[PDB]
Enzyme design. Structure first.
Site, mmCIF file in Angstrom:
data_model
loop_
_atom_site.group_PDB
_atom_site.id
_atom_site.type_symbol
_atom_site.label_atom_id
_atom_site.label_comp_id
_atom_site.label_asym_id
_atom_site.label_seq_id
_atom_site.Cartn_x
_atom_site.Cartn_y
_atom_site.Cartn_z
ATOM 1 N N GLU A 1 15.142 -27.621 50.410
ATOM 2 C CA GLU A 1 14.641 -26.242 50.525
ATOM 3 C C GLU A 1 14.353 -25.939 51.996
ATOM 4 O O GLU A 1 14.990 -25.070 52.577
ATOM 5 C CB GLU A 1 13.408 -26.060 49.638
ATOM 6 N N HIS B 1 13.740 -31.041 44.453
ATOM 7 C CA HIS B 1 14.830 -30.064 44.450
ATOM 8 C C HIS B 1 16.039 -30.807 44.989
ATOM 9 O O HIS B 1 15.923 -31.619 45.910
ATOM 10 C CB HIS B 1 14.513 -28.872 45.331
ATOM 11 N N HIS C 1 7.589 -33.261 42.159
ATOM 12 C CA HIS C 1 8.892 -32.900 41.648
ATOM 13 C C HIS C 1 9.840 -32.874 42.834
ATOM 14 O O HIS C 1 9.412 -32.983 43.978
ATOM 15 C CB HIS C 1 8.880 -31.546 40.948
ATOM 16 N N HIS D 1 8.455 -32.769 46.631
ATOM 17 C CA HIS D 1 7.225 -31.985 46.784
ATOM 18 C C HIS D 1 6.073 -32.619 46.027
ATOM 19 O O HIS D 1 6.121 -32.692 44.800
ATOM 20 C CB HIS D 1 7.445 -30.579 46.262
ATOM 21 N N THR E 1 7.835 -22.094 46.324
ATOM 22 C CA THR E 1 9.282 -21.824 46.507
ATOM 23 C C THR E 1 9.967 -21.430 45.198
ATOM 24 O O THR E 1 11.180 -21.166 45.205
ATOM 25 C CB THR E 1 10.017 -23.022 47.074
ATOM 26 N N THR E 2 9.192 -21.333 44.113
ATOM 27 C CA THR E 2 9.663 -20.757 42.859
ATOM 28 C C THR E 2 8.763 -19.614 42.459
ATOM 29 O O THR E 2 7.585 -19.592 42.831
ATOM 30 C CB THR E 2 9.686 -21.761 41.693
ATOM 31 N N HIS F 1 13.494 -26.241 35.176
ATOM 32 C CA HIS F 1 13.722 -25.916 36.593
ATOM 33 C C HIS F 1 13.832 -27.177 37.458
ATOM 34 O O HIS F 1 14.605 -27.215 38.419
ATOM 35 C CB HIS F 1 12.607 -25.039 37.141
#
Ligand SMILES: NS(=O)(=O)c1ccc([Se]C2CCCCC2)cc1
Ligand SMILES: NS(=O)(=O)c1ccc([Se]C2CCCCC2)cc1
Ligand SMILES: [Zn+2]
Length: 259
Positions: A105, A95, A93, A118, A197-198, A63
């Site tokens: 995000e 995005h 991590h 994040h 957010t996942t 992911h």
């Protein structure tokens, strides 16, 4: 088994079928309307204390990629701001997008950044991360926007190792990395109560989103985009556009740390 992802057939529009909290009352990310957000004098000074941070490993989890820390003691912590008590850094991590015009995000007045970092922390009053995620104040995520411009020197060691974790399930040693090199100069921020957010989308996060983006080079973010969602030997699916869009604010206010 978990089969959610970011494609048309398993992406954010599908998640609610297996994770009904996707349509909940405090979901993340959100758009930050800078004109509506209000300075909050009750916020205490933010304290990012990463001097003793101990990085261990970097993992492609299919992911994103996580840089993992030793969180067996209070080695790197986040305190203050909206937070009551001590939150321990466990991993960071990112995005990011397929193109520089998308990837974050959170959005700021509907603007999307190229990526979002994040830094994930858990409230030590709950003893372990697994217990913390079951609490409304279990996690604090420090969110930092990335824009494309000049290179971020403190990011380069992360970029340099990505070739070795191309596919899902690969990991590599990642000791002696200083996460302080990923911050902007200013700690001005916005804060609100939200969620992961996942999937599983748990409503356990106090979000702290820095106002000042960091600049990374086009070459740095291009290397993020060479990662794979798939495992070794499987058809290549580039790891790009691993972001959830903004969710309804509902009965929430975004507070600003700055006047
Ligand atoms: N509700 S969800 O967790 O997002 C979710 C979505 C889809 C699937 Se199966 C699907 C996966 C992509 C390829 C075709 C078959 C399971 C779970
Ligand atoms: N994108 S994010 O909101 O910072 C974020 C942070 C951490 C995780 Se790990 C997950 C593992 C299962 C139990 C719940 C926590 C997912 C998403
Ligand atoms: Zn995240």
């Amino acid at each position: 088994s978990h089969h959610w992802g970011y494609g048309k057939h398993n992406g954010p529009e599908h998640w609610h079928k297996d994770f009904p909290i996707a349509k909940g009352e405090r979901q993340s990310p959100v758009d930050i309307d800078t004109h509506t957000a209000k300075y909050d004098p009750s916020l205490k000074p933010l304290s990012v204390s990463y001097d003793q941070a101990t990085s261990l490993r970097i993992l492609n989890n299919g992911h994103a990629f996580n840089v993992e820390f030793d969180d067996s003691q209070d080695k790197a912590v986040l305190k203050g701001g909206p937070l009551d008590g001590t939150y321990r850094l466990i991993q960071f991590h990112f995005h990011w997008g397929s193109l520089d015009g998308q990837g974050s995000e959170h959005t700021v007045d509907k603007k999307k950044y190229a990526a979002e970092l994040h830094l994930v922390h858990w409230n030590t009053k709950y003893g372990d991360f697994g217990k913390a995620v079951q609490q409304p104040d279990g996690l604090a995520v420090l969110g930092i926007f990335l824009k494309v411009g000049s290179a971020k020197p403190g990011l380069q060691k992360v970029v340099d190792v990505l070739d070795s974790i191309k596919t899902k399930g690969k990991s590599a040693d990642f000791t002696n990395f200083d996460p302080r090199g990923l911050l902007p100069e200013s700690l001005d921020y916005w804060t609100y109560p939200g969620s992961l957010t996942t999937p599983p989308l748990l409503e356990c996060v106090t979000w702290i989103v820095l106002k000042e983006p960091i600049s990374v080079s086009s070459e740095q973010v291009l290397k993020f985009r060479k990662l794979n969602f798939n495992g070794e030997g499987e058809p290549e699916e580039l790891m790009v556009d691993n972001w959830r869009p903004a969710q309804p604010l509902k009965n929430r206010q975004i507070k600003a740390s700055f006047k």
